[PDB]
Structures are given as structure tokens and as C-alpha cells.
Design a protein around this motif. Structure first.
Motif, PDB file in Angstrom:
ATOM      1  N   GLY A   6       0.824  -1.181   0.000  1.00 12.14           N
ATOM      2  CA  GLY A   6       0.000   0.000   0.000  1.00 12.14           C
ATOM      3  C   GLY A   6       0.859   1.231   0.000  1.00 12.14           C
ATOM      4  O   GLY A   6       2.084   1.187   0.193  1.00 12.14           O
ATOM      5  N   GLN A   7       0.208   2.348  -0.275  1.00 13.29           N
ATOM      6  CA  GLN A   7       0.995   3.493  -0.662  1.00 13.29           C
ATOM      7  C   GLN A   7       1.776   4.071   0.493  1.00 13.29           C
ATOM      8  O   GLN A   7       2.950   4.430   0.301  1.00 13.29           O
ATOM      9  N   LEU A   8       1.209   4.171   1.690  1.00 12.26           N
ATOM     10  CA  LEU A   8       1.974   4.714   2.796  1.00 12.26           C
ATOM     11  C   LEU A   8       3.140   3.808   3.159  1.00 12.26           C
ATOM     12  O   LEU A   8       4.220   4.313   3.504  1.00 12.26           O
TER      13      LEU A   8
HETATM   14 NA    NA Z   1      -1.596   3.430   2.318  1.00 14.17          NA
END
Ligand code: NA
Ligand code: NA
Lengths: 30, 30, 30, 30
Positions: B1-3
Motif C-alpha cells: 500500500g501506498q503509505l
Molecule cells: Na496506504
């Protein structure tokens, strides 16, 4: 002297980036 | 996921900055 | 909010790194 | 030479951090 001081500033920035990374992980994970 | 991806990239940048700091200290000290 | 704060801190770090880069170029060139 | 190259690496890292900051802002804002 001046290169050593700049190096220390870079090490402090690295520490700050590690803090941010941790914060982002905690946001992601809960 | 992006974080998680972003956190990883920040940790990688931190490592790079420490390597640069080390090179500066090497240049200074000889 | 937290992501906006973090983004700001990353922009501030980027500015600091550019200032350090400038100082290194100044040291080199005289 | 070597300080100029290190300075350029720092400028590239600054650019990378600005990209991350933008990405975080877009996550925050939608
Ligand atoms: Na994220
Ligand atoms: Na947020």
C-alpha cells in the motif's frame, strides 16, 4: 570542521526521515 | 500500500544520506 | 492534518538539502 | 569533482522528497 558539521546535519535529517517513515507506518497499520 | 511504500522510500533515502555523510567524513579526514 | 504536516516537513527537508548542496558547491569552487 | 557530484545527489534526493510530498498531499486531498 565544515564537512564534519554538514555530515552531522545529514545524519540528523536521516533520523528525521526515519521518524516520518515510522509515523506513516503507524497511520497505515493503526 | 501506498503509505508503506512511501515509508520504505524514506528509509532508503535516509540510508543514502548517511552514506553521503560518511563520504564527506572520509573526504575530510583522509 | 497529519499527511499535510508530513508533506510540509518533507518540503522543508528538501529545502535544507538544497542549502547543503549549495554549501558543498561553495566549498568546492571557492 | 567529488563534492559537486555529492551536491548533485543531494539535489536529486530533494527532488524525490518533493515528489513524495506531492503524493502525500494528493492522498490527503483526493
Ligand atoms: Na496506504
Ligand atoms: Na492526514
Amino acid at each position: 570542521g565544515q564537512l564534519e558539521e554538514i555530515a552531522q546535519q545529514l545524519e540528523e535529517i536521516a533520523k528525521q526521515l526515519k521518524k516520518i517513515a515510522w509515523q506513516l507506518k503507524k497511520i497505515a497499520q493503526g
